[PDB]
């Protein structure tokens, strides 16, 4: 549970649905709340992230487990908008 | 907000100006995400911080800024 910050470095991140997210490149800190703010990710999965940045930042609150890998809540999905005259829902 | 690697081996100083050492590592809780300690490679002999494996154990409660010099107080 408690350990050193260097452990994050190089760890692969997966979602709790088994899907690869990427490799931790850095850890984003906050003096005001004495807490980890986010994880900087690189070598990141294009199938899941539409983005052209060198790396992306995942907020730390979606981290579920840190072991040999980091598991996060799978947030790489699309919500469906509700339609008033259709029981089906829309995706754009 | 500060990336952790940008704190790599920075110098750590007290409120008066004493050079405490160079940052070695950072202790954190992985579930909570709370930052717990600093681990500073010593250079001077401040009695205000206890030691383990030859590093200063600075509670993160005592950190007061983290710009070009890590600044630390006794309380």
TrEMBL record, chain A:
User: PRC-barrel domain: from which residue to which, for each copy?
Assistant: 5-74
Q: Which InterPro entries match?
A: PRC-brl_dom, PRC_barrel-like_sf
- The protein's name is PRC-barrel domain-containing protein
In which organism is this protein found? Archaeoglobus fulgidus
UniProtKB/TrEMBL annotation, chain B:
The cross-references to InterPro entries, in alphabetical order and at most eight, read: PRC-brl_dom (IPR027275), PRC_barrel-like_sf (IPR011033)
SUPFAM superfamilies under this entry?
A: PRC-barrel domain (SSF50346)
Q: Which residues form the PRC-barrel domain?
A: 4-75
Tell me which Pfam families the record gives: PRC
PANTHER family given in the database record: PRC-BARREL DOMAIN PROTEIN (PTHR38137), PRC-BARREL DOMAIN-CONTAINING PROTEIN (PTHR38137:SF2)
UniProt name for this protein: PRC-barrel domain-containing protein
| Organism field | Archaeoglobus fulgidus
Taxonomic path: Archaea, Methanobacteriati, Methanobacteriota, Archaeoglobi, Archaeoglobales
